[PDB]
């Protein structure tokens, strides 16, 4: 139910905000992606 971020390696949903640094629970690997949009995108099929 709802997510905000993700880890490059240990692909695990996070969810944060200012103050709590930008790392992850377990492995540091301080990267993190930003998981898709909720409002699905549509495509021409040509």
């Amino acid at each position: 139910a709802t997510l905000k971020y993700i880890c490059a390696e240990c692909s695990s949903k996070l969810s944060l905000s200012r103050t709590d640094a930008v790392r992850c629970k377990d492995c540091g690997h301080r990267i993190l992606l930003k998981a898709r949009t909720k409002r699905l995108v549509q495509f021409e099929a040509r």
């Binding site: 692909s11 898709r36 699905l40 995108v41 549509q42 495509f43 021409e44 099929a45 040509r46």
Partner: protein, 266 residues
């Protein structure tokens, strides 16, 4: 019988080698084109993506989904979304498939043409069934996924023709030859020593009378008999690719008359 005539040689589920004779190159050609570009068909033309953890990109996948041939038998009883009155689309003018795949296996999970699940009412009529001719009964490999890769789409097939785009062509390829023994002299074989020795003879030479050197050039000659081989992709029955072609071309010439009338009024 009456006018132009056929002599279907070979024939199958994906081909119709035949011999259309007693016509006009002009008309043979027109038929040849129409088959390639103006016969309606059903094709995926919209793809919403809810999820895609695939190694391929959204539009990459969409492009293919549209390339996937779909059952277009009763296509002629599905309207063009443009013509239909629904704000956007409906069962009266569109088929809606679904697609979902999950890396369940511990080893490369495939996704196939077959995996599409129609979800709109087909108001009972042959349309939108992913055409499969593949041995294992899978048809067109859309894409692959590893561990937890997912993919949730939704496709909307709509009517349409080859001109608007290639995915609407049921054509595939179309053989066409005539006058295999260069008699009309519609060519001038290139050569090093002997044209005849250097230029391969076509299987169509048999079905027709050889040259006979002595004889003078026949200028009154004309092009009759065209050896055509209309393949097919499946969206429609080989035979139909021909009839529906003959039929469309027919409607085309039709309108010209019709319009040429609404004009007479004033």
């Amino acid at each position: 019988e009456e006018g132009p005539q056929v002599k279907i040689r070979e024939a199958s589920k994906d081909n119709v080698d035949f011999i259309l004779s007693n016509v006009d190159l002009a008309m043979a050609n027109s038929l040849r084109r129409v088959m390639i570009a103006e016969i309606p068909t059903l094709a995926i033309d919209s793809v919403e993506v809810e999820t895609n953890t695939t190694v391929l990109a959204d539009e990459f996948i969409a492009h293919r989904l549209g390339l996937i041939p779909l059952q277009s038998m009763d296509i002629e009883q599905l309207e063009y979304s443009r013509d239909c009155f629904c704000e956007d689309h409906c069962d009266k003018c569109s088929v809606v498939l679904t697609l979902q795949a999950f890396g369940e296996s511990e080893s490369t999970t495939n996704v196939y043409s077959k995996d599409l699940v129609i979800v709109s009412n087909l108001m009972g009529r042959n349309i939108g069934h992913p055409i499969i001719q593949d041995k294992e009964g899978n048809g067109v490999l859309i894409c692959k996924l590893r561990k937890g890769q997912e993919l949730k789409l939704t496709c909307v097939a709509k009517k349409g023709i080859a001109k608007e785009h290639a995915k609407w062509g049921p054509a595939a390829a179309i053989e066409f030859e005539y006058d295999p023994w260069n008699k009309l002299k519609h060519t001038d074989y290139w050569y090093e020593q002997d044209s005849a020795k250097e230029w391969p003879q076509s299987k169509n030479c048999e079905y027709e009378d050889p040259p006979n050197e002595g004889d003078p050039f026949d200028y009154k000659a004309q092009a009759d008999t065209f050896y055509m081989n209309v393949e097919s992709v499946g969206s429609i029955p080989v035979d139909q690719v021909v009839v529906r072609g003959i039929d469309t071309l027919q409607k085309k010439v039709a309108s010209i008359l019709l319009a040429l009338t609404q004009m007479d009024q004033d």
